[PDB]
Each structure stands twice: as structure tokens, then as C-alpha cells.
Coordinates of C-alpha atoms in Angstrom, one line a residue:
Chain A
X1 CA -247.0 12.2 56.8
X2 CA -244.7 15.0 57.5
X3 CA -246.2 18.5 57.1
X4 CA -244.5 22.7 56.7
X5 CA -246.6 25.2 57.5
X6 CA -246.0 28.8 59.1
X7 CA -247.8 28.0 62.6
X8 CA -248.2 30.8 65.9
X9 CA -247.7 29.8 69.4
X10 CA -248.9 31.6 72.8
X11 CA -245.7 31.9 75.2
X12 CA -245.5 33.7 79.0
X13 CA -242.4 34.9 80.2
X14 CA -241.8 35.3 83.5
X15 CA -241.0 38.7 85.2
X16 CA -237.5 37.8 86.7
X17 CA -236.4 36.5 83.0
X18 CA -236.4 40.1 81.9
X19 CA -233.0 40.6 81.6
X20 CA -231.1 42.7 79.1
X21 CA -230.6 40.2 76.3
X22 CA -234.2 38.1 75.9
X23 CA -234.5 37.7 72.5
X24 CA -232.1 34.8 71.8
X25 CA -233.6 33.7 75.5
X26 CA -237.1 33.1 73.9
X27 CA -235.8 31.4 71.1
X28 CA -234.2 28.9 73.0
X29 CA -237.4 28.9 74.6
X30 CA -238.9 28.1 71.6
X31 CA -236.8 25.4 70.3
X32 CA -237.4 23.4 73.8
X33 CA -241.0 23.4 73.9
X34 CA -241.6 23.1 69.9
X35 CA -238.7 20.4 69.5
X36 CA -240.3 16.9 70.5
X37 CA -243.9 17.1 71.1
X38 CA -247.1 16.0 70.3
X39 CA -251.1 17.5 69.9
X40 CA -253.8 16.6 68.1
X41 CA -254.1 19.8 65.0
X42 CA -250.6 19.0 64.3
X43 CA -249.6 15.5 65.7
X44 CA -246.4 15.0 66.6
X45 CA -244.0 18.6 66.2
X46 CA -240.6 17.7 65.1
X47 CA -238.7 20.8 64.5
X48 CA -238.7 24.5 63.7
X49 CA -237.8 26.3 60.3
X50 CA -236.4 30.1 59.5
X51 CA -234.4 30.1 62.5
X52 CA -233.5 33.8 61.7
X53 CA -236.0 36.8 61.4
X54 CA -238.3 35.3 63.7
X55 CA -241.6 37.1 64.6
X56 CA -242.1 38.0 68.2
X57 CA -241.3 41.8 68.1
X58 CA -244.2 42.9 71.3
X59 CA -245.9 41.6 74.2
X60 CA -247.9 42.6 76.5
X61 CA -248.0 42.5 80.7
X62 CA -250.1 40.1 82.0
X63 CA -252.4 42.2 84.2
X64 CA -252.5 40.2 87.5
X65 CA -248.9 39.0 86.8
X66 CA -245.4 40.3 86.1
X67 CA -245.9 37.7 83.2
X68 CA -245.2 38.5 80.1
X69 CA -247.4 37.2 76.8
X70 CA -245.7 36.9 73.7
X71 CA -246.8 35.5 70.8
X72 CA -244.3 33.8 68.1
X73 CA -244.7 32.9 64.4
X74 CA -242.5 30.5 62.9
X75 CA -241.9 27.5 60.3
X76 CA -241.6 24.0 61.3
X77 CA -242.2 20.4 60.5
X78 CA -244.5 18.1 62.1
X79 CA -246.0 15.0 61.6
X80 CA -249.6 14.4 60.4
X81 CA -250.6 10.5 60.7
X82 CA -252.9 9.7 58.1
X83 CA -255.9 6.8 57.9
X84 CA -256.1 4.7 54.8
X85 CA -252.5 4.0 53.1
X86 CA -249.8 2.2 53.6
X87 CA -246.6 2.2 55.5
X88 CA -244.1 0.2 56.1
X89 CA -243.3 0.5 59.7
X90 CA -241.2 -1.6 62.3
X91 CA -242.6 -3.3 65.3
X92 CA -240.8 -3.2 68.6
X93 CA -243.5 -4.9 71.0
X94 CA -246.0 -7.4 70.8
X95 CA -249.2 -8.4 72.6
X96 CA -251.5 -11.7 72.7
X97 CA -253.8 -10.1 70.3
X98 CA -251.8 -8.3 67.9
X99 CA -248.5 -6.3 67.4
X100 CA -247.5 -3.1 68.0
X101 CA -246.4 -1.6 65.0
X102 CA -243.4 1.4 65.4
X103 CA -244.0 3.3 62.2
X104 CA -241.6 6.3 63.1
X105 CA -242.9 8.1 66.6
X106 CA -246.3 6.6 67.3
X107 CA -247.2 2.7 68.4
X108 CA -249.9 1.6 66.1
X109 CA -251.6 -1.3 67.1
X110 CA -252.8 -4.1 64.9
X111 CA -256.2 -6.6 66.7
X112 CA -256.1 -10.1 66.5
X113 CA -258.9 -9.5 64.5
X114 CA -257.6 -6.9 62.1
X115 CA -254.9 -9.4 61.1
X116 CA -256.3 -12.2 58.0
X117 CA -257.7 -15.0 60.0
X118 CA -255.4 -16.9 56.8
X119 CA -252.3 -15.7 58.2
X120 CA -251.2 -18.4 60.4
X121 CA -250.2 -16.9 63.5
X122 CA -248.0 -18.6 65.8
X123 CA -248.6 -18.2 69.7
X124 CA -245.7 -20.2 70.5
X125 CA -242.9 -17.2 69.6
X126 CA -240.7 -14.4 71.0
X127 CA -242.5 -11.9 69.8
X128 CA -245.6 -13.6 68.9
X129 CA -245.2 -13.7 65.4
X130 CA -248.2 -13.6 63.1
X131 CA -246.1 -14.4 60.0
X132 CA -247.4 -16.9 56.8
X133 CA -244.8 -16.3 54.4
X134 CA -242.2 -13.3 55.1
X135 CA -243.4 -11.1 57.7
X136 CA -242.0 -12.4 60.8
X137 CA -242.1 -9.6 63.6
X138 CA -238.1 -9.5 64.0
X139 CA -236.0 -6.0 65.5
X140 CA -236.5 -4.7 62.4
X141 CA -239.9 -6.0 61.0
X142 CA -240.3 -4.2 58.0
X143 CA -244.7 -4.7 58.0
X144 CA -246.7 -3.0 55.2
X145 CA -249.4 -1.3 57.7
X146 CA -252.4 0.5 56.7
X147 CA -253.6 2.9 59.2
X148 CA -257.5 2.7 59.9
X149 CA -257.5 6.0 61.7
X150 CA -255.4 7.4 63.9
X151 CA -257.7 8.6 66.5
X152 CA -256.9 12.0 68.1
X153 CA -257.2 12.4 71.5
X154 CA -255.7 14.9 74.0
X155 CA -251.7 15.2 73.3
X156 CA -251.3 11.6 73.6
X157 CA -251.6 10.0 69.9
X158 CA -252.7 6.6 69.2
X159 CA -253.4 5.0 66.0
X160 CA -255.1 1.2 64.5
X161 CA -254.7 -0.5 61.8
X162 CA -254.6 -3.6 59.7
X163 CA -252.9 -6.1 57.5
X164 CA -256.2 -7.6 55.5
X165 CA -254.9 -6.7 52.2
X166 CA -252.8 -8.0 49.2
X167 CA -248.8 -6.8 50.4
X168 CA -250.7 -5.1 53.3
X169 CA -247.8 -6.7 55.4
X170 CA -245.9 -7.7 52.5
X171 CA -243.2 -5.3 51.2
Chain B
X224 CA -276.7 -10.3 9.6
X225 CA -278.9 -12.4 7.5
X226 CA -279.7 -10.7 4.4
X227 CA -278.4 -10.1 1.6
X228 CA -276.8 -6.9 0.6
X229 CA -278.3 -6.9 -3.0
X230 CA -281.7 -7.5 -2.1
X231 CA -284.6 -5.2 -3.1
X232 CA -286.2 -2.7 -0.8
X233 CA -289.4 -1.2 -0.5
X234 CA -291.2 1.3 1.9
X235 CA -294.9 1.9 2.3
X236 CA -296.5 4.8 4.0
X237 CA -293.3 5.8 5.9
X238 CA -293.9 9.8 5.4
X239 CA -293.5 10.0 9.0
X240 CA -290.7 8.1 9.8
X241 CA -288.6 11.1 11.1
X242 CA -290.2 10.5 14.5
X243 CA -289.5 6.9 14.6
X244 CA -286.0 8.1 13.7
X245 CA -286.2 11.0 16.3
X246 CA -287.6 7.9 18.8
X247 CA -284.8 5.5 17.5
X248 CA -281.9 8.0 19.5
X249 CA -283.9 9.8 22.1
X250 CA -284.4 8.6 25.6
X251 CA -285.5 10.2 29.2
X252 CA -284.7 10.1 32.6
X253 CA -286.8 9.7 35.7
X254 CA -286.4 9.6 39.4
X255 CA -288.2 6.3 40.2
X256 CA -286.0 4.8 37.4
X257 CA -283.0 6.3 39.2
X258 CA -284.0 4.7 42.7
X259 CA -284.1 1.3 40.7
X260 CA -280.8 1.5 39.2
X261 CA -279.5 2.4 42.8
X262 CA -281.3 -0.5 43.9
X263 CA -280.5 -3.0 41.1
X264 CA -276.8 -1.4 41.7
X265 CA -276.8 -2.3 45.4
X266 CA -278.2 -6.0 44.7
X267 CA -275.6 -6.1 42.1
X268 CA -273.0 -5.2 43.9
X269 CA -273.9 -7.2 47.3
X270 CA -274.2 -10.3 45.0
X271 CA -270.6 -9.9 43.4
X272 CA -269.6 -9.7 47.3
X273 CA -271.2 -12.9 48.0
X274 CA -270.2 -14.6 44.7
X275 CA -266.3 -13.3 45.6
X276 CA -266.8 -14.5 48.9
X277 CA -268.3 -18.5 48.1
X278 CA -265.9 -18.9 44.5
X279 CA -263.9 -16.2 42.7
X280 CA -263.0 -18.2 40.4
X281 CA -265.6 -17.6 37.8
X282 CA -265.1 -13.7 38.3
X283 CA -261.7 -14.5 38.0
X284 CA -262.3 -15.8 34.9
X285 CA -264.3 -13.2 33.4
X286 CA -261.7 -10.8 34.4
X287 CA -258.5 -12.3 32.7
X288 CA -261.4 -12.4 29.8
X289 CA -261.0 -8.6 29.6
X290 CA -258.0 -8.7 30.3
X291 CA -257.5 -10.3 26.7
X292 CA -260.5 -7.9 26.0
X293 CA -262.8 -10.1 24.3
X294 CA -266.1 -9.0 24.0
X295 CA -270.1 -10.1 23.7
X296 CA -270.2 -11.6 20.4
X297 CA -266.9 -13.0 21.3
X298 CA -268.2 -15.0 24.6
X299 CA -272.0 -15.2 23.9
X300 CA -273.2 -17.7 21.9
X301 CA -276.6 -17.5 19.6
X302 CA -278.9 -19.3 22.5
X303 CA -277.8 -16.7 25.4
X304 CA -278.7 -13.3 24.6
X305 CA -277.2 -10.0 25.3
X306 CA -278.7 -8.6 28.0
X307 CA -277.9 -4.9 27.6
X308 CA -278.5 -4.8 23.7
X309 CA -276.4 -2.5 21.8
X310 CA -278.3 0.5 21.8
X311 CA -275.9 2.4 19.0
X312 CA -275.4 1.8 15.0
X313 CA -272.8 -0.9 14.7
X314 CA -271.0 1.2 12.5
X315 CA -270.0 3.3 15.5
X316 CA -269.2 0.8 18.0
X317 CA -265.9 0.3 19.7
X318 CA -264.0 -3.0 19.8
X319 CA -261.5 -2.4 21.8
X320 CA -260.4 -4.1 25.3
X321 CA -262.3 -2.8 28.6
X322 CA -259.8 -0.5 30.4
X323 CA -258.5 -1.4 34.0
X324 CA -260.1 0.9 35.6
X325 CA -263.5 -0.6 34.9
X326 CA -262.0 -4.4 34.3
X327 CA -262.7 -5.5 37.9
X328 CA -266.0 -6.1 38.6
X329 CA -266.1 -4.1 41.7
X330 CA -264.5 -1.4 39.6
X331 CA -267.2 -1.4 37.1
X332 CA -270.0 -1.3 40.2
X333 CA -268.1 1.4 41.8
X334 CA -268.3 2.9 37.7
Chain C
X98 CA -295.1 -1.0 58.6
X99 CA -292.0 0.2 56.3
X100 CA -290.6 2.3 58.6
X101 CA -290.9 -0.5 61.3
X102 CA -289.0 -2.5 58.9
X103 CA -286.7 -0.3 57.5
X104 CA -285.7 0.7 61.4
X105 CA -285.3 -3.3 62.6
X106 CA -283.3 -3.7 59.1
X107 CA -280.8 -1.0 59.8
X108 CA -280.6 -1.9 63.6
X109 CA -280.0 -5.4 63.0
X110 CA -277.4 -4.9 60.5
X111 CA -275.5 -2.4 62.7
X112 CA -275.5 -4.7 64.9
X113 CA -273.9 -7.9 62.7
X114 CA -271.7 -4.9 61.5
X115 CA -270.7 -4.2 64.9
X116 CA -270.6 -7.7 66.2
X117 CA -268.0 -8.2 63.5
X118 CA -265.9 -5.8 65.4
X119 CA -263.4 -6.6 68.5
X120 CA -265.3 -7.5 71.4
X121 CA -263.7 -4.7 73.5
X122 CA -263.3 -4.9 77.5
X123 CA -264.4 -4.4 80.8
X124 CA -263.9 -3.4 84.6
X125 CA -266.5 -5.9 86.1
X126 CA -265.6 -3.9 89.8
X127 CA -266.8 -1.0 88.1
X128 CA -268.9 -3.1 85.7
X129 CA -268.0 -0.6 83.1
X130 CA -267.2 -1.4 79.8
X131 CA -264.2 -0.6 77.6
X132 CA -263.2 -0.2 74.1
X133 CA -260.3 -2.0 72.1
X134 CA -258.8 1.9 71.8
X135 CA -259.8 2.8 75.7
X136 CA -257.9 -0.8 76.3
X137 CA -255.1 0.7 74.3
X138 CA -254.5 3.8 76.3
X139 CA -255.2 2.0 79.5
X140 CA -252.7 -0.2 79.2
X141 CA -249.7 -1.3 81.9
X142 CA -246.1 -0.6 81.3
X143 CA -245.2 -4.1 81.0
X144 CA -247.5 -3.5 77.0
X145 CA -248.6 -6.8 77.7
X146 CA -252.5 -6.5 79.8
X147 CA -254.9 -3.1 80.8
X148 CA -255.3 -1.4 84.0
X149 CA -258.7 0.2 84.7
X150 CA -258.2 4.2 85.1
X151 CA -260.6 3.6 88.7
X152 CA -260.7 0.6 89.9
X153 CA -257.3 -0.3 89.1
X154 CA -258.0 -3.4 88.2
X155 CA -257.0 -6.1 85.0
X156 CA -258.8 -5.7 81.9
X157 CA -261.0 -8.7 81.0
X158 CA -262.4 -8.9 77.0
X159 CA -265.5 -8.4 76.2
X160 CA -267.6 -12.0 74.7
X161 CA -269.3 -11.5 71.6
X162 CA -267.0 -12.9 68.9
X163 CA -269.0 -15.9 68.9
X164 CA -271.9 -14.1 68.8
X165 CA -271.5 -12.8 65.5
X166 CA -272.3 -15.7 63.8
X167 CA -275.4 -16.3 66.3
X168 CA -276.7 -12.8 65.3
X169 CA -275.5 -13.1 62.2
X170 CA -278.3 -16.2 61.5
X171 CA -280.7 -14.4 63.7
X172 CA -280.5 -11.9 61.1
X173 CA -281.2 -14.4 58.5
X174 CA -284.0 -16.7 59.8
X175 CA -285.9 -13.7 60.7
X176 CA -285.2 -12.2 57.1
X177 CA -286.9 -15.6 56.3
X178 CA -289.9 -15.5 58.5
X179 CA -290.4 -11.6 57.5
X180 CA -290.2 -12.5 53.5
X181 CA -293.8 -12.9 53.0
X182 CA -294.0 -9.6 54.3
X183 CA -291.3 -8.0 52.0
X184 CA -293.0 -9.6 48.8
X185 CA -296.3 -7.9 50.1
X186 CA -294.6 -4.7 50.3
X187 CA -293.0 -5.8 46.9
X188 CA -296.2 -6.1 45.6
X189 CA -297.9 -3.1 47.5
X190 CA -295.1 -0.8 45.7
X191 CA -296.6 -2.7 42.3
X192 CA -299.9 -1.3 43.1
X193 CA -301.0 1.9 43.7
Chain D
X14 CA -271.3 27.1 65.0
X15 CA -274.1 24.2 63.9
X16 CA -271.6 21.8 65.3
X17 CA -270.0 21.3 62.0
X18 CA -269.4 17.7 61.6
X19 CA -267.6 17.7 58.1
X20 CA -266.5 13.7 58.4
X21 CA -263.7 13.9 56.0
X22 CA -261.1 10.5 54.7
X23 CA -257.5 11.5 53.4
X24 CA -256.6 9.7 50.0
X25 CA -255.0 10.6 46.4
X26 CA -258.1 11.1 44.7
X27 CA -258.2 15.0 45.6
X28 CA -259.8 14.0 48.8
X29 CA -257.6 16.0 50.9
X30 CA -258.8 17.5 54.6
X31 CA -259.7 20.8 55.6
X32 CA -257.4 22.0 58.4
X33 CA -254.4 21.3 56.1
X34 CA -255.9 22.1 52.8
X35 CA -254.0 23.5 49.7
X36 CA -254.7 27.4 49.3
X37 CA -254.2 29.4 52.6
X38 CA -253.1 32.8 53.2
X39 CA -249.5 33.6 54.8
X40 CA -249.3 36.1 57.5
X41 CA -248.1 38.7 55.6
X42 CA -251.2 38.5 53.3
X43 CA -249.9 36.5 50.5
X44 CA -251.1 33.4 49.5
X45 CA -250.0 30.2 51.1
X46 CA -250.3 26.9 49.1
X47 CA -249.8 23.7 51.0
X48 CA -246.5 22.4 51.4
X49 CA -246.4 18.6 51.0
X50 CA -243.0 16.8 51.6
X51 CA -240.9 13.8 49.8
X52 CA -239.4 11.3 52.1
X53 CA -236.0 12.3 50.5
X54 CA -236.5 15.7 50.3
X55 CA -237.0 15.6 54.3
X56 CA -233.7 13.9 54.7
X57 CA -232.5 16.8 52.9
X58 CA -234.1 19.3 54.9
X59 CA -233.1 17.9 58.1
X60 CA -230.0 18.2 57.5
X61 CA -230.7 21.8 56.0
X62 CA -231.9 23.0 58.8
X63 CA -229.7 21.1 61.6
X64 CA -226.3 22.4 59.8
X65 CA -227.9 26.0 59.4
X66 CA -228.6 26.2 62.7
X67 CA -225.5 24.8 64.5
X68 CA -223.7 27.2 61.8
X69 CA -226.0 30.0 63.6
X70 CA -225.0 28.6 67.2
X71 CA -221.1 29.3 65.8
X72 CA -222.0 32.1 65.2
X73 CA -223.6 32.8 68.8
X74 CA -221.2 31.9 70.4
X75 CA -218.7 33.9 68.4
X76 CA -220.2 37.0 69.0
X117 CA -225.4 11.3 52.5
X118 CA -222.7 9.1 55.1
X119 CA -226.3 7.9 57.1
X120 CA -224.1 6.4 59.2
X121 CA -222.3 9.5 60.6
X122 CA -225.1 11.4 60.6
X123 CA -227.6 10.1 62.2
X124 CA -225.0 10.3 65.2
X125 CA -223.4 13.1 64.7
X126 CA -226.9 15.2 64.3
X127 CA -227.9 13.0 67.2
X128 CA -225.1 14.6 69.7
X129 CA -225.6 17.7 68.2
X130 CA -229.3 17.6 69.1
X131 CA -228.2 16.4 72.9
X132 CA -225.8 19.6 72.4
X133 CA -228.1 21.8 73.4
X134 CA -231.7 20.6 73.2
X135 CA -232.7 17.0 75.8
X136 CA -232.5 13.6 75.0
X137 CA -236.2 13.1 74.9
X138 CA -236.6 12.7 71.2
X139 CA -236.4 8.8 71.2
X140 CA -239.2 9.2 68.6
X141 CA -237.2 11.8 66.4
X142 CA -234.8 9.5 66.6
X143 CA -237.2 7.1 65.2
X144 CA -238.3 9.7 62.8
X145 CA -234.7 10.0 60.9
X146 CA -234.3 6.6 61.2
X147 CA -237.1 5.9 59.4
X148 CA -236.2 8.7 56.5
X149 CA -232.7 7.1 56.4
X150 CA -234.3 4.1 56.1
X151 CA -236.8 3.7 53.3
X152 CA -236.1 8.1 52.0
X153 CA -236.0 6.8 47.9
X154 CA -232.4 8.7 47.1
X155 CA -229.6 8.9 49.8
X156 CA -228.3 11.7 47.7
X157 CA -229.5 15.1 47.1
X158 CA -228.8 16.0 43.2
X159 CA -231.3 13.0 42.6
X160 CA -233.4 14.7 44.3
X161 CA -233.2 18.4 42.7
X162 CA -233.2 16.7 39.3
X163 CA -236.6 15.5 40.4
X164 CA -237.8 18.3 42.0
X165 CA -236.7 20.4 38.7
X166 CA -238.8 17.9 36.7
X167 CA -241.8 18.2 39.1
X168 CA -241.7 22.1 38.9
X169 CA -242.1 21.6 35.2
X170 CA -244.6 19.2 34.8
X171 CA -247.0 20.4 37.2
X172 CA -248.4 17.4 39.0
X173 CA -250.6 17.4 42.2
X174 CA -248.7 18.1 44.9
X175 CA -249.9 15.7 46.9
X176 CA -250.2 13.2 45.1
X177 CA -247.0 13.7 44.2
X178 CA -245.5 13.8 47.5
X179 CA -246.6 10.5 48.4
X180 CA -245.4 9.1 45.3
X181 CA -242.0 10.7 46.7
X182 CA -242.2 9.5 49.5
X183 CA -242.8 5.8 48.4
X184 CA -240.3 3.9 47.6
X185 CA -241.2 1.4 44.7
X186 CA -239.9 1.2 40.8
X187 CA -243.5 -1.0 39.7
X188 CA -246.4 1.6 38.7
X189 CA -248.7 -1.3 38.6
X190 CA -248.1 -2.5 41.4
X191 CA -248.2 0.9 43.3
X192 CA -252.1 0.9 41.3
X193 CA -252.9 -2.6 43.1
X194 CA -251.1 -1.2 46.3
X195 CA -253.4 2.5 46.4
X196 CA -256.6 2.1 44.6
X197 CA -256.7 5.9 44.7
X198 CA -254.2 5.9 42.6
X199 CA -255.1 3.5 40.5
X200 CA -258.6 5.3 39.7
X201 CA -256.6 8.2 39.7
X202 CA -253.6 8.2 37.4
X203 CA -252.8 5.8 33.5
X204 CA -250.5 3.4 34.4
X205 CA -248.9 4.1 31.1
X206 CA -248.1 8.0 32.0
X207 CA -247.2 6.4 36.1
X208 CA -244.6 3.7 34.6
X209 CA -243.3 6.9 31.9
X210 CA -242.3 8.6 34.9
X211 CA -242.0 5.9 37.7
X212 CA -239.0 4.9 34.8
X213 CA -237.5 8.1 34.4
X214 CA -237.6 8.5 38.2
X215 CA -236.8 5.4 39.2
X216 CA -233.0 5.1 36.7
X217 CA -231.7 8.1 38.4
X218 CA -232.5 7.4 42.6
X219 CA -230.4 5.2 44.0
X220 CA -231.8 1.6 44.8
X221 CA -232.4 -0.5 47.2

């Protein structure tokens, strides 16, 4: 789930961006390479907080390079995913062996064997839909997932999970 | 249970009955008897697994049975005995239903 | 005696626990094996097979989903044949 | 240092993970509690934040209708920042989608509830961020919280919750 927290970053400048007005320069800066991404800490980074006041204030000169370091403190929301609880996500793509769940920015996956062996899944549709009563994968395909872990990796994210549980693909 | 309240009642030689008192409400705590209860608990709790696994319906049963909070006198019968007997004055018991949290049978092994 | 039975106890229930699990993959060029998750970020852009990162080459599943049940009864016939043995010890830990 | 394993699960029973634990310290020395979000409450901030800062970009260059505004905060976004954030997109779609009050006095009225009881923040926040009116139900759905919380004090305020945000 979605997390605020006052967080630093580490940002070089280079020599022939020194210009007279730089300030409003490295917060654009900022907002292009905080704005839509991903790590492991912090997940996926959605956007900043405290636009105003921000804290850069010094750097320093690279010693080898006209580079300059700067280092910036600012509010912001990310994502964290979870393992363990439920969400109710939306699937986009399917495999053979199991669906690829949506839930917001990530593609969980569910196994063929992480879905109830009682849940009568249908080969034979577009997407393969492992539905018994309600929860036919559809454009929107509103599944009650539960995250198993979302393993963290290099700043790629990828997440598992299952539907063996009572509305654990029921809503 | 059966005797009667208006009975006569006599003691012999009881001038150190205090300590079978003392013994009546006193207990200790040892580690061997705590590996066995981990034991008995994981044997317990594997058999519930299997026994939820081949027919639920009996702890099913037993549930919905606290659910309505009946109790051991209320399901025992004279022939079966209680296995845990009630270790505290009957004057002090509680006869209330089991609370949720406990209900489930998993719940109470997780307890 | 106990440790030798306590360590092919635990090893052959890790391994019905991780038979239990997805089978997983492999690059048979390579003859590498590969994870459900390593077959999940090796995947094509079509989100329908796996690549190999080296050999380029289609990811085939692993078989052992019908070997949990084999390993699964191998666990419990040779529970059976080592019972005599567990009531020993059963009685060994009655003794002194 | 000694490899410090620390395996660690994230639920609603106060088992809650280390590198975003509750008490930190802010930079300025002060004392910096977690902040744990409502799914509502981010669909307030969003906006928050997207119309202070275009207000800060009139500015610049000087010197709730889900419909419109996913859109609208969309081609602002394209505005000045890159298309990229198919995922954000996602993101807002998914608090417009299931976020438990579309409106945000429901949500202040909650909040100023919250501030006086003095629940877990957390837990609370996932409560939030659910979207159900059945406090059994939610105890079958989280185990945590069923160990965790009476069902009699969840339905007393799933009720009084659940009357003033606007259903689904």
C-alpha cells in the first residue's frame, strides 16, 4: 500500500547546466526522475510532496568532473506492495497456467497451482478464464488477490499470489 | 451431586488438612512437561489438519455447537468422561458461550 | 541414531513440502534449471511462453507434479518400515 | 554487520516491518511517526497536490467529478511531465475505483473521529482503505484482524463509518 515519508536523493548536475537560474531547473529535474519509477526500499515512486521550500541549498564539485553533486530532501508518495492481504485487483493478460493480475502498477501473477484445484477452470476461453461462480477474468476482472510476497529484485518489481481462500477471488 | 444437603458430617484426624488445602490449588511447571504439551499440541493440531482434510463435518458440528455455546455437561453424557476435569470450585465456574476467537478449532490450537 | 532420524525426517518433509510446489523450468541447451519467478521475469513480449536469458531458447516446465504423490507415499511406507524404530526410541525416552 | 537476516511478514496484528516502521526521526530532529494512507484520503491528496502544484506552475509562469478528473489531471500530467506513467494511470484508476468516499467531507469527518479515538494507525489505514460495510465478514476476510479487534467495537464503528461514505 501507498506510503509518505520525507526521503533524500543523490543528483549530478552537469557543468554546462550552470546557468543563472538553476534552482527551479533541479526541481524539474526532480519531478522527472522521482515521478514514475520503481526500486526495491520504496517500490514503485509515484509523486513528490512540499513542492515549495525544498531542501537542496549546497553542492559540491565533483573533483574529476565539472559535475555538480547535490543532494535533495523532499516528501512524496510511493507504493509499498505488501505479502499476505487481500486486494482486489483487475487482470489485463492471461497465460496457460494462470492469470496475470493488474492490481494498480505491478503484474502479479497467479500459478496454475496457486488457483483451488475446485475452481473449474476453463482452457477453452479468451482469456482463459479460471472462473466457478463469478470471477470470470473479463476487462475489468474485479479478483480478490492475496499477495504471497512480492519478491524484490533490482528496480524491476514482481509479485505472486493466490486465490485458495474463502472470497480470495470473490468480492 | 449425590448427596444430600442435610446430611451429617464428620472429620477425623484432619489437623493437617491446610496442606491438602494448600495442595488442592497449587500446581508447578516443568520443562519436559512443556516439550510434551508442544508435542501433544503439534499432534493435536496435525490431526485436526487431517480430520478437516478427510470430513469437516463433525468439526463443523462441534463448532456451530459453540456457536450456540453449549458446554460439557451440556454434550457429555454420564458414560463419556471429561477429559480435562474442572480443576476450579464449581461455584466459580463460568457458563458462558466460548468466544470466536477461540471457537474454531484451529483458533483454539493456535490459543 | 536420532539425529540420523531427525535429519532424514526434516529432509524428507522439505522435500514433499517442496514437491508440493510449481515444478519450475528449464533451459535443456544450457541444461540449467529455472524457477516459476525466474520463468516470470524471463518471459517473451507476447506474456504468453519464457525465453532463456543465454541460450535464448523456449522455456520447458519442470516434471515433478506427479511426483508429489510418489514422494509423498515414499514418505509414508518408509515412516512404516522405520516405526519399530520410533517406538524403540519411544521407549528408550521411557527409560533412562 | 552479522548479516542480519531479520525475516519479517507484514499483517494487522502489530507485525509491521522495520524499514518502514512507526517512530523515526525527521531531519530536522523531531520525531517522525509513520504516515499510513486511506484509499480515500489518497484520492484527496492527489488532487491536493496536483492542483497546488499547477497553481505553483501559474504562478511560474507569471512571474469528486472522477470522470473529469482523471483526464483532466491526466493532460495536466502530459503538460509538462512524459506519458510514461501508464501505471499511475493505473494507480488513480484504481483509487477512483474502489477509494470508499468519492467526497472529501466524509472523509475529514472520519479523519476527525480517528484523531479522537486513537486507533492504530495502521491498522486503521487498511481498514480505510477497504472498502466493505460487514465487520464479520472483514474478521473471516483478515484473520489478523479478527484475533486482533471485537467484532462488536469493528461493527460500532464499521456502522457509524459505513452511514456517512458514499456506497457502492
Amino acid at each position: 500500500m501507498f506510503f509518505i515519508k520525507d526521503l533524500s536523493l543523490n543528483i549530478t548536475l552537469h557543468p554546462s547546466f550552470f546557468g543563472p537560474r538553476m534552482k527551479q531547473y533541479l526541481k524539474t529535474k526532480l519531478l522527472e526522475e522521482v515521478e514514475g519509477s520503481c526500486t526495491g526500499k520504496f517500490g514503485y515512486i509515484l509523486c513528490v510532496l512540499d513542492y515549495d521550500n525544498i531542501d537542496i541549498q549546497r553542492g559540491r564539485i565533483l573533483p574529476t568532473d565539472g559535475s555538480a553533486e547535490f543532494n535533495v530532501k523532499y516528501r512524496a508518495v510511493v507504493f509499498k506492495p505488501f505479502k499476505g492481504e487481500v486486494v482486489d485487483g483487475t487482470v489485463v493478460s492471461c497465460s496457460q497456467h494462470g492469470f496475470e493480475v493488474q492490481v494498480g502498477p505491478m503484474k502479479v501473477f497467479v500459478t496454475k497451482h496457486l488457483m483451488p484445484q475446485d475452481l473449474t477452470f476453463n482452457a477453452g476461453s479468451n482469456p482463459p478464464s479460471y472462473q466457478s461462480s463469478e470471477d470470470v477474468i473479463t476487462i475489468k476482472s474485479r479478483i480478490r488477490v492475496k499477495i504471497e510476497g512480492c519478491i524484490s529484485q533490482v528496480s524491476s518489481i514482481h509479485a505472486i499470489g493466490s486465490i485458495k481462500e474463502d472470497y480470495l477471488g470473490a468480492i | 451431586n449425590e448427596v444430600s444437603k442435610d446430611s451429617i458430617v464428620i472429620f477425623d484426624e484432619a489437623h493437617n488438612i491446610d496442606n491438602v488445602c494448600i495442595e488442592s490449588l497449587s500446581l508447578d511447571l516443568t520443562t519436559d512437561a512443556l516439550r510434551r504439551a508442544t508435542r501433544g499440541a503439534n499432534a493435536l493440531d496435525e490431526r485436526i489438519s487431517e480430520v478437516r482434510k478427510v470430513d469437516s463435518q463433525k468439526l463443523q458440528d462441534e463448532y456451530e455447537k459453540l456457536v450456540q455455546g453449549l458446554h460439557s455437561a451440556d454434550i457429555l453424557t454420564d458414560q463419556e468422561e471429561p477429559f480435562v476435569e474442572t480443576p476450579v470450585l464449581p461455584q466459580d465456574l463460568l457458563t458462558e458461550a466460548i468466544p470466536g476467537n477461540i471457537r474454531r478449532a484451529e483458533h483454539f490450537v493456535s490459543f | 541414531i536420532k539425529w540420523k532420524v531427525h535429519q532424514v525426517v526434516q529432509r524428507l518433509k522439505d522435500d514433499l513440502d517442496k514437491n508440493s510446489e510449481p515444478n519450475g523450468y528449464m533451459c535443456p541447451i544450457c541444461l540449467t534449471k529455472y524457477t516459476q519467478l525466474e520463468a516470470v521475469q524471463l518471459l517473451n513480449f507476447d506474456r504468453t511462453e519464457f525465453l532463456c536469458s543465454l541460450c535464448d531458447e523456449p522455456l520447458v516446465e519442470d516434471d515433478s507434479g506427479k511426483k508429489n504423490k510418489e514422494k509423498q507415499d515414499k514418505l509414508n511406507r518408509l515412516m512404516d518400515q522405520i516405526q519399530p524404530i520410533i517406538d524403540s526410541l519411544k521407549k528408550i525416552d521411557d527409560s533412562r | 554487520r552479522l548479516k542480519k537476516v531479520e525475516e519479517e511478514e507484514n499483517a494487522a496484528t502489530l507485525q509491521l516491518g522495520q524499514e518502514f516502521q512507526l517512530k523515526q526521526i525527521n531531519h530536522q530532529g523531531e520525531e517522525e511517526e509513520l504516515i499510513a494512507l486511506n484509499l480515500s484520503e489518497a484520492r484527496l491528496v492527489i488532487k491536493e497536490a496536483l492542483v497546488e502544484r499547477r497553481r505553483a506552475f501559474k504562478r511560474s509562469q507569471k512571474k469528486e467529478t472522477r470522470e473529469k478528473e482523471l483526464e483532466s489531471i491526466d493532460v495536466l500530467l502530459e503538460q509538462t511531465t512524459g506519458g510514461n506513467n501508464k501505471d499511475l494511470k493505473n494507480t488513480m484508476q484504481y483509487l477512483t475505483n474502489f477509494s470508499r468516499f468519492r467526497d472529501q467531507e466524509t472523509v475529514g469527518a472520519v479523519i476527525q473521529l480517528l484523531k479522537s479515538t486513537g486507533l492504530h494507525p495502521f491498522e486503521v489505514a487498511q481498514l480505510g482503505s477497504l472498502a466493505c460495510d460487514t465487520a464479520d465478514e472483514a474478521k473471516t476476510l483478515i484473520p489478523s484482524l479478527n484475533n486482533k479487534i471485537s467484532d462488536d467495537e469493528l461493527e460500532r464503528i464499521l456502522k457509524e463509518l459505513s452511514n456517512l461514505e458514499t456506497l457502492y
